[PDB]
Every structure is written in structure tokens, then in C-alpha cells.
Design a protein around this ligand. Structure first.
Ligand code: CHL
Ligand code: CLA
Ligand code: CLA
Ligand code: CLA
Ligand code: CLA
Ligand code: CLA
Ligand code: CLA
Ligand SMILES: CC(/C=C/C=C(C)/C=C/[C@@]12O[C@]1(C)C[C@@H](O)CC2(C)C)=C\C=C\C=C(C)\C=C\C=C(C)\C=C\[C@@]12O[C@]1(C)C[C@@H](O)CC2(C)C
Ligand SMILES: CC(/C=C/C=C(C)/C=C/[C@@]12O[C@]1(C)C[C@@H](O)CC2(C)C)=C\C=C\C=C(C)\C=C\C=C(C)\C=C\[C@@]12O[C@]1(C)C[C@@H](O)CC2(C)C
Ligand SMILES: CC1=C[C@H](O)CC(C)(C)[C@H]1/C=C/C(C)=C/C=C/C(C)=C/C=C/C=C(C)/C=C/C=C(C)/C=C/C1=C(C)C[C@H](O)CC1(C)C
Ligand SMILES: CC1=C(/C=C/C(C)=C/C=C/C(C)=C\C=C\C=C(C)\C=C\C=C(C)\C=C\C2=C(C)CCCC2(C)C)C(C)(C)CCC1
Lengths: 39, 195, 204, 152
């Protein structure tokens, strides 16, 4: 379990989770406030 | 000294020495001691101006509503006509603050270095703490006690929050702060962030 | 330490002694192997149990009386979508400030076990619990039934966690039945009591 | 107006473009039954198209002869939403990322085997530094003033 938590922290795994979370956030901002060119 | 969050470890640079220490710096803005020194003065001066402004914004509206005076709303008073042009007022406000604030500045950089009158060189502030000049700025000679400083800071933090409210409440309701309160007292469960 | 296990003949995990209430040796994924996590999961199980029981009795009993006539309470699944004295979104704000405060102090008690047993406005009032999760005092154990011998506290808390576990499967069943069938829970039970061998999860 | 442009709210080619665009989607719309899922979807695109064009007109965007919005980044105060304002937001976030990134390399630089926390993130440490970014302008300015930011 602690071995698993170490693996889940390895560069690639932490990157997909980080960027997945990022992509979801940016997608939903674009679903709620689409087509923003100003600001 | 106090705990803004019961049971939460205070930052270690918040040691119970400053009036208003309730352990509140969760974002660590003030860990560097020189930031802490500067933010103490910045909290005092923002809180003192908020207290003057919030009083100047709320209380005149209360006394018009009563009918003892009739003054413009705070967000309208700039429009009014005064004996001098508003650009004239600004230039003298700039020049007078420029002098007075550089002087406040010198005392932060170099405490005590600017306590004496530069013209009538026989007058002087007595030695004291930065942000608390005393002397002629305390003509009623109130003791600048820990309790007084803590009340000063509590009132300043509340006025700063209230000013934040006046600003957001006005750009949302178009009316004024005592108006928002009277309207809210009417039937509270329906006019409470329904705008 | 020699207790009945969720899997007779199997070997319980090393992190589960039997000193916890409701310890039957069940954690095949090691979600509680780390002691720091096992203490957090105990608190999480305790509050999930206590909310599920309030929720179960709050959907099973009121729906049980409206299926008759003693009550007229609408469907538990739709009670939220209907309108009340103020709008639902004002009730949610009042809920957060009120539940967040109660949750905040519970949170502080989990992370710092003794810090919030005293009333902040009237410091005379105090809670009496000794263990995290069982605050005691007049507001949560006015009868004193929470302070007993550790033998009775083991059973009483095992009754607590068992009733909470069953309630969790029940509430989750009520949510799932209402979506697969098309009515309330009391309807599902009678339908299955009308014909046990056919009125089940199968329709085809 | 600025640079010989005209407000998109007054621009004829801007209005033409919205019209040609809706007509394009309506040519597809007419293929499907009005309750159908494609009809709802094409209609959703159409409303979004209409929201977009009115939004650009109401925000003060200038348009060229092409009927397209053209951004004014010179500093002119009627157009801060086109560069200054989203740009301040970018620099605030970008500095947050970099300041947090440096905090982590500094936090682990004196560790035993430092490259170990570079290929296996010490997530607990990172959750503790992630909010140092909120105040990077003050923290970075402070490390400058007292010799901590740059090496000699
Ligand atoms: C202390 C802070 C302060 C605040 C919060 C305001 C707030 C306001 N003033 Mg005011 N003023 C302030 C200081 C001063 N004003 C004035 C003289 C005026 C005039 C002549 C006018 C205003 C107006 C206004 C309003 C227009 C908002 C704006 O200009 O965009 C803020 C933009 C940025 C900050 C950028 C707004 C309610 C206008 C008004 O009354 O319209 C409703 C107006 O005509 N003010 C002087 C004397 C030079 C000041 C001295 O410090
Ligand atoms: C990770 C970032 C992220 C964030 C901040 C949100 C945030 C939100 N989502 Mg979302 N979502 C995400 C990822 C995310 N989602 C992903 C990865 C999926 C794919 C499974 C979805 C699928 C999804 C659905 C299907 C719905 C939301 C809805 C919502 C909103 C709830 C109201 C909320 C603002 C709901 C909403 O706003 O209703 C339209 C909603 O219906 N989300
Ligand atoms: C987590 C537990 C929980 C929750 C969230 C709900 C939620 C709800 N119940 Mg409910 N209920 C529950 C447990 C719960 N129930 C249990 C255990 C029982 C059985 C005893 C009932 C019996 C019940 C009945 C008989 C009725 C509801 C109704 C309702 C709805 C509106 C009631 C309301 O908020 O009015 C406001 C509620 C209050 C102001 C009470 C809060 C005050 C408490 C008691 C704090 C203690 C006060 C303190 C001493 C001072 C709402 C969907 C009503 C409904 O269907 O409406 C459509 C309804 O008629 N419930
Ligand atoms: C000015 C900043 C500030 C902020 C942001 C907070 C924020 C908070 N305080 Mg705090 N507090 C403050 C100043 C502040 N306090 C001061 C100056 C005092 C007096 C010393 C307290 C005394 C206080 C007590 C006594 C308690 C809180 C509690 C809380 C939490 C309530 C949770 C909730 O949703 O309630 C809605 C919340 C995180 C409660 C909490 O959950 O603490 C764990 C609580 O019990 N606060
Ligand atoms: C069958 C379920 C069950 C059982 C066995 C217990 C058992 C216990 N709880 Mg618990 N609890 C439960 C459900 C349960 N609780 C639920 C659903 C909630 C959420 C409201 C709580 C909230 C709660 C708190 C906040 C506290 C306890 C405490 C306690 C301990 C002493 C109180 C006691 O003897 O309760 C006896 C319980 C019963 C005999 C069940 C009666 C059920 C009916 C519905 C009566 C309720 C009437 C109501 C007005 C409607 C004991 C281990 C206290 C403790 O440990 O203090 C040290 C404590 O602080 N529990
Ligand atoms: C190519 C170099 C260049 C650079 C560096 C800038 C830089 C700037 N322009 Mg700009 N500008 C340029 C070319 C340039 N401009 C050209 C060629 C034009 C002609 C179309 C303009 C027309 C223009 C307008 C119309 C305005 C600006 C403004 C501004 C300021 C941006 C907002 C700000 O931070 O206010 C901070 C301002 C200062 C710190 C001091 C500014 C005043 C001194 C004299 C400069 C900034 C100083 C705005 C401005 O000054 O807002 C107050 C503004 O209204 N610019
Ligand atoms: C802590 C992170 C960090 C920081 C503060 C900087 C800072 C800087 N870089 Mg560098 N860089 C980084 C990571 C970082 N870099 C990485 C990962 C790479 C490999 C792709 C590079 C490759 C790179 C090149 C090729 C150049 C710079 C240059 C520069 C300087 C100018 C700004 C620039 O061009 O950004 C450019 C940034 C990039 C090209 C990519 C970096 C962006 C990543 C996403 C940020 C780091 C994320 C990191 C994983 C955070 C984890 C923290 C977490 C554990 C808490 C400035 C000193 C330039 C320079 O020397 O000018 C003087 C230059 O020529 N950098
Ligand atoms: C200056 C003050 C307002 C003064 C306004 C006065 C002069 C108004 C004057 C006038 O009205 C009159 C009389 C007449 C009117 O006709 C015209 C005007 C001209 C309008 C507001 C400051 C307002 C000050 C604001 C509200 C400060 C709030 C910042 C707080 C919340 C920071 C919280 C935390 O920062 C900590 C402390 C540490 C971190 O770890 C965590 C976080 C959360 C970041
Ligand atoms: C069951 C679920 C938890 C199940 C998790 C279990 C299985 C996990 C098992 C394992 O992890 C272990 C142990 C060990 C691992 O090695 C293996 C696995 C297998 C991973 C919690 C549900 C928890 C469900 C609880 C919290 C829900 C409470 C809901 C209340 C508030 C509802 C109130 C209302 O219903 C009323 C009363 C009236 C209505 O009209 C209105 C509303 C508002 C709907
Ligand atoms: C130093 C000197 C020296 C000598 O020797 C002596 C002497 C003279 C004593 C001294 C002086 C001092 C003085 C100046 C003081 C002043 C103070 C004041 C200003 C305060 C205010 C203070 C201020 C305050 C707090 C403020 C508060 C505010 C409030 C909360 C508000 C609330 C509001 C809100 C938001 C909104 C709504 O809609 C309305 C209301 C509800 C209304
Ligand atoms: C205004 C304007 C403009 C202009 C601009 C300019 C011109 C600018 C310049 C600028 C400059 C000319 C700059 C310089 C700089 C220098 C240097 C020297 C820097 C450095 C930096 C640093 C050092 C950093 C650090 C950091 C931080 C802070 C955080 C993150 C991380 C790091 C570490 C990176 C325009 C027109 C566009 C538009 C409008 C407005």
C-alpha cells in the first residue's frame, strides 16, 4: 500500500493525474464560459 | 495568543507579541520577519483608513434616512460641485499626502529619525513605536495599551471587511449600504443573495 | 483477538486486532494498513454510519406511513426537488454555515484530540468524551450511556457500527431500487412479499 | 476608430458572418426531425453561435474590413481585456508555478539522494508548498532584497 502510494507518485503517474485534473478544469470553464476572447 | 482555528498550530513566527496575534497566516505571507514588520504597518494604515471611510460612508447615509441632514450617497458625492475643481483637490491631496507619507515612510525605515519638527525645530514627538506616533497625534494622552491596540486592530479588521462589503454590495444592488440593510430587514428570507 | 471473522478459516490482517468495535478482520485491499489511515477510516466509518441511520429512518419510516395514510410525505427521491418556505439554495447556505461549523470542530478534534471540548462562548460548558468519535457531554450523551465499562462500550459501539453498516447498504439500496423499479421502498417490499419467487430484481 | 477599425457591434461584415454561419448550421438542421438528438445538438451550436456574436459586440471589440475582431494590445484603456488583463492573470499564475517549482527543488536539494524526489514526487511536501505560490511577488521580492534569490 505504501509501495503503491510510492508508485502513484512516480513522475509519469503524478503527471497524468495532474494534467487530467487540469484538463477537466479547463474543459468545464470552457463549457460554463465558452468563446471567451476578451479576458 | 488567540486561535483563529481552535487546535491549529500557529505559525512559529506568530509568537504572541503583536497585538492581534490569533495565529492567522495560513498562506505564510509573513514568515520573513521583514515582511511581518512591513505588513504590521500596512494593516494599521489600511485599517485606520477603512475605519474613517466606512464611518464616512455608512453614518451619513444613516443620518439622511433619519432626516437630520441630507447629503449625497457615498458613490455619488464625487459628482457634486464643490468650491474647487476636483482636479484641483486631487493635486493638493497628492502634494499633502506625498509629504506626510514620505515622513511616515522614513520612520518605518529608520525609527525615531523623523520625530522632530523640521521648521519649528523645538517641537518633537516623543520616542515610541512605529505606527504609533503619539505626542501631538495623541493630544488626549490615552495610554497606548495592549488592549487599546488590540481594539484598534479588531475595529480596523472589521471596517476593512465592511468596506469590502459596501463595494461588492453596491455594484450588485445599485443602492447604498444602509439601504441594503433596511431592505434586508423587511423580509430577510427572500432578499439575501438572490440578486 | 480470537473473534469470529468475516472469513472463517482465513487469517485476519495484522493491522486488525479486535480492539476496534466491529472488527471482523475485513480489509482485503489494505485500505487501513497504515495506522494513520486506519484512524481516519474509523472516524469516516462512524459518521457514514450515523448519517446512513438517520437517512434510513428518514426515508423508510416516512415513506412507510404515506404508503398508508398516517402521513402524506412525498417520495423521498423527489422531496428535494419540491419547494419549501424559502428556496432550496438558501437552505443550502444555512446548512453549510451550520454544518460546516459542526464539521469544523469535529475536524479539529480528529487532528488534535482535546482542543475543542470547551464551549467557546460560555467556557463552563464542556464535553465529556475521551475517545475521538464519541464526544459525550450533555449535548451528545446526556444520559451517560456513553460512559461505561470497556466491555460494554465494545458491544455498544459494535451495535452502533453494525446498525450503521446495515443502514449504509439499505440507503444505497433505496437509491438503486428507486431507479430500477419506479416506486418507493415500501412498494418494493410488498411486491416481493406478494410474490417472492418472481417479483425480484428480474423483469426481462 | 483605432487603426481604422469599427466596433463589431456596428460592423456589417461581422453581422453578415453570423448570418452566413447560422445559415450553414440550418442547412444541416433541416435534415433531422425536430425532436431528434441531432436537431437539439445543431440547435445548441446555433444558440451558442448567437451568444458568441452578441457577446463580442457587447464587449467593445473592434472589427476590421474582414468582419473579424482585432485585438488592441497597445495599452489603450478601452481594450485591457484583450491583453493587459488576461496577461496579468497569466503572469500571476506562471509565477505561481515557477515559485512553487523552485520551492520544491530547494526543499529537496539538501536531501540524501536529491534526484529521488525528482522522479518520485514527495506529494506531502508538495501539498505544503503549492500555496507558497499565492504570494510569489512578495516572497520573490523578499528573497531578492536579502541575497537569497540569486547566487554570487
Ligand atoms: C479613496 C478611494 C476612492 C474610491 C473607492 C472612489 C470611488 C468612486 N469615485 Mg471618487 N473615489 C475615491 C477617491 C476620490 N474620488 C475623488 C473624486 C471623484 C469625482 C469627481 C468622481 C468620482 C467618482 C467615483 C466613482 C467612479 C468609479 C471610478 O472612478 O473608477 C475607478 C477606476 C479605477 C480605480 C482604475 C466611484 C464610486 C465619479 C462618480 O461620482 O460617479 C459615480 C466622479 O465623477 N470621484 C477624489 C478627489 C480628486 C478622490 C480622492 O482620493
Ligand atoms: C477535474 C475537473 C473537473 C471539475 C472542476 C468539474 C466540475 C463540475 N462538473 Mg464535471 N466532469 C469532469 C471533471 C471535472 N468537473 C470529468 C473528467 C468528467 C467526465 C466523466 C465530468 C463530467 C461531468 C458531468 C457529466 C457533469 C459534470 C458537472 C459538473 C459541475 C457540477 C455542478 C461542476 C462545476 C455537472 C454539471 O454542471 O451539469 C451540467 C454534470 O452534469 N461533470
Ligand atoms: C439526516 C437526516 C434527515 C434529513 C436530512 C431529513 C430531511 C427531510 N425530512 Mg426527515 N426524518 C428523518 C431524518 C432526516 N430527514 C428521520 C430520522 C425521521 C423520523 C423521525 C424523519 C421524519 C420526517 C417527517 C415525518 C417529515 C420529514 C420531512 C423532511 C423534509 C423536510 C423537513 C425539513 O427540513 O423541515 C425543517 C426541519 C426542521 C426545522 C427540523 C430541524 C430541527 C432539529 C430537530 C434540530 C433540533 C432542534 C433543537 C432541539 C433546538 C426533508 C427532505 C418532511 C417532508 O417530507 O417534507 C416534504 C416530513 O413531513 N422527515
Ligand atoms: C479573521 C479570520 C478568520 C477566519 C477566516 C476564521 C475561520 C474559521 N473559524 Mg475562526 N476565529 C477568528 C478569526 C477567523 N476565523 C478569531 C479572530 C477568533 C477569536 C480568537 C476565532 C475563533 C474561532 C472559534 C472559537 C472557532 C472558529 C472556527 C472557525 C471555522 C468555522 C467553520 C465554518 O464553516 O463555520 C461556518 C473557520 C475555518 C470554528 C472551528 O471550526 O474551529 C475548528 C470554532 O470552533 N474560530
Ligand atoms: C442503533 C444505532 C446506534 C447505537 C447502538 C448507538 C450507540 C451509541 N452512540 Mg450513537 N448515533 C447513532 C446511532 C447509534 N448510536 C446515530 C444514527 C447518530 C446520529 C444522530 C448517533 C450520534 C451519536 C453521538 C453524537 C454520540 C453517540 C453516542 C453513542 C454511545 C452512547 C449513547 C448510547 O448509548 O446510544 C443509545 C442509542 C439507542 C438506544 C438507540 C435509540 C434509537 C431511537 C431512534 C432513539 C432516538 C429518538 C429520537 C429523538 C428520534 C453509544 C456507543 C455518544 C457517545 O459515545 O458518548 C460518549 C455520542 O457522543 N452517537
Ligand atoms: C511600443 C511601446 C509601448 C509601450 C511600452 C507602451 C506601454 C504602455 N501603454 Mg501604450 N501605446 C503605444 C506604445 C507603447 N505603449 C503606441 C505606439 C500607442 C499609440 C496607439 C499607444 C497608446 C496607448 C494608450 C492610448 C494608452 C497606452 C497605455 C499604456 C500603459 C499600459 C497600462 C499601464 O500599465 O498603465 C500604467 C501607466 C504608467 C506606469 C505611466 C504611463 C504614463 C507615462 C507618461 C508613460 C503602458 C505604460 C495606457 C496608459 O498609459 O494608461 C494610463 C493608455 O491609456 N498606450
Ligand atoms: C522549477 C521549474 C522551473 C523554473 C522556475 C524555470 C525557470 C527558468 N527557465 Mg527553465 N526549465 C524547466 C523548469 C523550470 N525553469 C524544465 C522542466 C525544463 C525542461 C523542459 C526547462 C527548460 C528551459 C529552457 C530550455 C530554458 C529555460 C529558461 C528558464 C528561465 C526563463 C523562463 C523560461 O524560459 O521558462 C521556460 C520554461 C520551460 C521551457 C519549461 C518549464 C516549464 C515546466 C512545466 C515548469 C516546471 C514544472 C515542475 C515539474 C514543477 C514541479 C513542482 C512540484 C513538485 C511542487 C528561468 C530561469 C530559459 C533561460 O535560460 O533563459 C535565461 C531557457 O532557455 N528553461
Ligand atoms: C483602505 C480601506 C478603505 C478606505 C476607504 C475610505 C478612505 C473611503 C473614503 C470615501 O468614502 C468616503 C468617506 C466618501 C465617499 O463619498 C467617497 C470615498 C472616497 C469612497 C479598505 C481596505 C480594505 C482591506 C481589505 C478588505 C483587506 C482584506 C485582506 C484580508 C482578507 C487578507 C486575509 C489573509 O491575508 C491574511 C491576513 C493572511 C493570509 O495567510 C491569508 C489571507 C486569506 C490571504
Ligand atoms: C454504503 C457506503 C459505503 C460502502 C463502502 C464499503 C462497501 C467498502 C468496502 C471495502 O472498503 C472495505 C471496507 C475494505 C476494502 O479492503 C474492500 C472494500 C470492498 C473496498 C456508504 C454510503 C453512505 C450513505 C450515507 C452517508 C447517506 C446518508 C444520506 C442521508 C443524509 C439521506 C437523507 C435523505 O434521505 C432522507 C432521510 C429523506 C429523503 O427524502 C431526502 C434525503 C436527503 C436523500
Ligand atoms: C488617536 C487619537 C488620539 C487622541 O489623543 C484621542 C482620540 C481622539 C481618542 C484618538 C482618536 C481616535 C479616533 C479617530 C477613532 C476613530 C475610530 C472610528 C473611525 C472607528 C470606526 C470603526 C468602523 C467600524 C468597526 C466599521 C464596522 C462596519 C460594520 C461591521 C458594517 C456592517 C454593514 C455591512 C457591511 C453592510 C450592510 O449593508 C450594512 C452594515 C450592517 C451596516
Ligand atoms: C507594459 C506593456 C507593454 C510592454 C512591456 C514591456 C516593454 C516590458 C518589458 C519588460 C522587461 C524589460 C523586463 C525585464 C526583466 C528582467 C529580469 C532580470 C527579470 C528576471 C526575473 C526573475 C529573476 C524571476 C524570478 C522568478 C520569479 C519571480 C517567480 C518564478 C520563478 C522565477 C525564479 C523565474 C506592452 C507594449 C507589451 C503591452 C502593453 C503594456
Amino acid at each position: 500500500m505504501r509501495d503503491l502510494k510510492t508508485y502513484l507518485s512516480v513522475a509519469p503517474v503524478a503527471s497524468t493525474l495532474w494534467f487530467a485534473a487540469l484538463a477537466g478544469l479547463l474543459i468545464e470553464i470552457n463549457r460554463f464560459f465558452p468563446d471567451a476572447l476578451t479576458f | 495568543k488567540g486561535e483563529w482555528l481552535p487546535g491549529l498550530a500557529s505559525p512559529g513566527y506568530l509568537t504572541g507579541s503583536l497585538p492581534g496575534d490569533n495565529g492567522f497566516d495560513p498562506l505564510g505571507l509573513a514568515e520573513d520577519p521583514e515582511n511581518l514588520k512591513w505588513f504590521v504597518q500596512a494593516e494599521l494604515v489600511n485599517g485606520r483608513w477603512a475605519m474613517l471611510g466606512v464611518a464616512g460612508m455608512l453614518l451619513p447615509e444613516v443620518f439622511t434616512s433619519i432626516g437630520i441632514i441630507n447629503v449625497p450617497k457615498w458613490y455619488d458625492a464625487g459628482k457634486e460641485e464643490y468650491f474647487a475643481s476636483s482636479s484641483t483637490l486631487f493635486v493638493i491631496e497628492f502634494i499633502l499626502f506625498h509629504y506626510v507619507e514620505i515622513r511616515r515612510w522614513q520612520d518605518i525605515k529608520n525609527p525615531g529619525s523623523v520625530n522632530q519638527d523640521p521648521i519649528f525645530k523645538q517641537y518633537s514627538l516623543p520616542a515610541g513605536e512605529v505606527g504609533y506616533p503619539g505626542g501631538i497625534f495623541n493630544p488626549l494622552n490615552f495610554a497606548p495599551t495592549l488592549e487599546a491596540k488590540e481594539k484598534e486592530i479588531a475595529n480596523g479588521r472589521l471596517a476593512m471587511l465592511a468596506f469590502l462589503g459596501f463595494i461588492i454590495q453596491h455594484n450588485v444592488t445599485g443602492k447604498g449600504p444602509f439601504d441594503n440593510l433596511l431592505q434586508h430587514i423587511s423580509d430577510p428570507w427572500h432578499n439575501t443573495i438572490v440578486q | 483477538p480470537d473473534r469470529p471473522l468475516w472469513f472463517p478459516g482465513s487469517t485476519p490482517p495484522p493491522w486488525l486486532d479486535g480492539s476496534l468495535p466491529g472488527d471482523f478482520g475485513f480489509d482485503p485491499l489494505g485500505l487501513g494498513s497504515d495506522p494513520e489511515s486506519l484512524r481516519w477510516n474509523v472516524q469516516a466509518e462512524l459518521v457514514h454510519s450515523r448519517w446512513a441511520m438517520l437517512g434510513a429512518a428518514g426515508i423508510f419510516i416516512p415513506e412507510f406511513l404515506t404508503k398508508l395514510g398516517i402521513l402524506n410525505t412525498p417520495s423521498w427521491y423527489t422531496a428535494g426537488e419540491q419547494e419549501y418556505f424559502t428556496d432550496t439554495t438558501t437552505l443550502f447556505i444555512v446548512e453549510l454555515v451550520f454544518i460546516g461549523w459542526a464539521e469544523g470542530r469535529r475536524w479539529a478534534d480528529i487532528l488534535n484530540p482535546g482542543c475543542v471540548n470547551t464551549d467557546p462562548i460560555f467556557p463552563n460548558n464542556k464535553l465529556t468524551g475521551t475517545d475521538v468519535g464519541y464526544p459525550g457531554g450533555l449535548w451528545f450523551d446526556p444520559l451517560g450511556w456513553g460512559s461505561a465499562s470497556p466491555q460494554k462500550l465494545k458491544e455498544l459501539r459494535t451495535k452502533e457500527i453494525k446498525n450503521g453498516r446495515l443502514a449504509m447498504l439499505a440507503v444505497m439500496g433505496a437509491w438503486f431500487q428507486h431507479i430500477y423499479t419506479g416506486t418507493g421502498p415500501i412498494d418494493n417490499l410488498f411486491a416481493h412479499l406478494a410474490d417472492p419467487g418472481h417479483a425480484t430484481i428480474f423483469a426481462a | 476608430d483605432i487603426a481604422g477599425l469599427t466596433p463589431c457591434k456596428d460592423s456589417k461584415q461581422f453581422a453578415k458572418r453570423e448570418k452566413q454561419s447560422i445559415k450553414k448550421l440550418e442547412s444541416s438542421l433541416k435534415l433531422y426531425a425536430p425532436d431528434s438528438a441531432p436537431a437539439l445538438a445543431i440547435n445548441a451550436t446555433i444558440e451558442k453561435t448567437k451568444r458568441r456574436f452578441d457577446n463580442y459586440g457587447k464587449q467593445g471589440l473592434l472589427c476590421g474590413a474582414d468582419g473579424l475582431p482585432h485585438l488592441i494590445v497597445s495599452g489603450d484603456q478601452r481594450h485591457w481585456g484583450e491583453f493587459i488583463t488576461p496577461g496579468i492573470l497569466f503572469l500571476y499564475i506562471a509565477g505561481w508555478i515557477g515559485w512553487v517549482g523552485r520551492s520544491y527543488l530547494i526543499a529537496i536539494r539538501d536531501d540524501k539522494k536529491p534526484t529521488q524526489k525528482e522522479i518520485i514526487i514527495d506529494v506531502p511536501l508538495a501539498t505544503r508548498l503549492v500555496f507558497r505560490g499565492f504570494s510569489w511577488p512578495i516572497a520573490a521580492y523578499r528573497e531578492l532584497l536579502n541575497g537569497e534569490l540569486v547566487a554570487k
